[PDB]
Amino acid sequence: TYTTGSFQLILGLNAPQVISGEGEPEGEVFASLASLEIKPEAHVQELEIRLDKDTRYLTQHTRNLQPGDTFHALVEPIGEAPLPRLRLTDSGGKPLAFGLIDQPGESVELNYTCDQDICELVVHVDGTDEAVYRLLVGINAPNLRESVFLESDLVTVGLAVDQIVGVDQRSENFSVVGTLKLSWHDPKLGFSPDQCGCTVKSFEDASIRAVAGEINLPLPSFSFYNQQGNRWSQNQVIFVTPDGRASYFERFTVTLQAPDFDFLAYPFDRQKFSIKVDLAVPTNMFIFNEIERFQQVVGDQLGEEEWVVTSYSQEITEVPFERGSTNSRFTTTLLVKRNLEYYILRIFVPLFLIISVSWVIFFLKDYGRQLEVASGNLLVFVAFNFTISGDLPRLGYLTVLDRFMIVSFCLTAIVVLISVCQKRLGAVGKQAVAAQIDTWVLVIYPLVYSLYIIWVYLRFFT
Amino acid sequence: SVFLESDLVTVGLAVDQIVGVDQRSENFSVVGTLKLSWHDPKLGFSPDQCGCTVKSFEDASIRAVAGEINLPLPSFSFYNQQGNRWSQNQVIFVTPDGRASYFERFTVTLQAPDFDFLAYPFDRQKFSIKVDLAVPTNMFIFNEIERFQQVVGDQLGEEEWVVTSYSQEITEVPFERGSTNSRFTTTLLVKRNLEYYILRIFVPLFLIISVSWVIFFLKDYGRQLEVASGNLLVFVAFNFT
Ligand SMILES: [Ca+2]
Ligand SMILES: [Ca+2]
């Protein structure tokens, strides 16, 4: 490949000390730059820009200009959009030129010439008196009638999840173990091998912020948006190639807040585990551009897990940033569900059998036995309820399971009340009414249970 | 003006989530955001000396920045803070004219000895967050309140505590070494979920009591005695459930 960088050139005429590399300037000059003999090379760039309702002001930064250079810019709307104002300022905000509306009043143009040793310019386009405009800019190109701007550095990102290690249903947070990777290109980080005799330079056990502060160069630092407390990190390394290609690697264990949890439909609920990585720099410096899948996003492990992942996705977006501008965001989302067989077999079948015991006793015609069995079955129900109390999260609000337990307990107690009434009726000599009540209860109870189940399904799952 | 004047500070606070309440030690934990803004000509700089329009400090407290630049700044603390405070996105940035602002995302635990649980579960409580300046009132004073977001944010799903109303106010309190310091207070009025307690406790209790009431219609007193004895055991079982 070729190479890039700055250089120092020493030329001598009949001065044998030059080949030592230490020749100090002397005598009268004899050579000059060749490019000065011809017209300077022009650079031209065109951009399409749009001023949304909340984004009526736009600014762009230019590359450095050498003394004697010239700058030209013009703006022409795509359609019937009104002509915006155009102006040019340096990096401090000092005005240098203002746009002039042409006599065929469809465009605005600007011109400037460089006096200082180094000039850094900013182009302002504003319509704050879906409009879309065409912006044309050139250096040493007066023929604009018939890259100049700086470009953001592109970052590649990737993330993999190894294990979900905990979920807190009262404080609404979860913890995850995984791996993160970043990669970008920066010519300012390049070095010359002959000064170190090596091809790879590395930094270990340091955050990107610390390395950036040590080498005094801007780097794409990041943070987890919903991080709770400190983060544990292993195998943290940064290494750079002579061309300037850099990469970051980290293995992390972190706890993330998740206020989006909703446990109303427990245990039939479905949840989302979202992991957000945000750059700590403005979008005009660094931006996420590509997604790399270095491993499986969701890793398989031996044995069963409490949460089963159904699907996942990865996406890049932009979010508002402090001190204006914008910062990039990388999001990983996992869709998870619980193990249904566990809850069904552990809770619902025994509950059904307990309910059946209280239902079947109405076939008896000896009401004392019916009363005694109902009284015993209520105690059995309460004992089973606290036995399963361990799988009953205390959240401060009702779930589906709590409502079902309450309804079942109420019906079980009403059975005892009806049994007492039937016993009294049989004692007074009205056995026919007791038999009619038995038939009514035997018909009605399963209908009530089925109707309650239908109502719950309608009100919670559709 | 002949006499020196205090610098005017604008403050704002937002609550994102209440993450826990301790009823025995009487404290609670909250997640939110804090913002400060003030103007000081001594912080001004010349753009041509940096080639920039904004100067920033990151991951540092106001006290540390004040000690680094050797100028007085409006430091602050949480009055009832328990233990260390977790902070994210901490930044201070200044404009050439001298306008400065502070930003912080925090998670903190605050003591609350004012809790009163006598009327449980029908009790109502106040969650109060107090921010005090660590400087005398003749140097810095809170002047205005900024509502940069909703004061109490909405979250998907139900919460254990329901916020009924809120308020924000600025006052003055006595300070060490005399004088006075400013205080900014945010108060949330909260209550519990009543349907949960009513349906989970009172209806089953009513049915259990009715079982012991109905048995007096019987004229076979052995059956009445046996059913009463069983119902007492059922009552104890439900109580420990
Ligand atoms: Ca929630
Ligand atoms: Ca108290």
Automatic annotation (TrEMBL), chain B:
It comes from the Bacteria. The chain holds residues 322 to 562 of 642 of the full protein. The keyword RNA-binding does not apply. Keywords: Calcium, Metal-binding. Ca(2+) 4 binds at residues 26, 113, 115, 158. Disulfide bonds join 50-52. The keyword Amino-acid biosynthesis does not apply. This is Uncharacterized protein. Ca(2+) 3 binds at residues 26, 113, 115, 156. Signal peptide: none annotated.
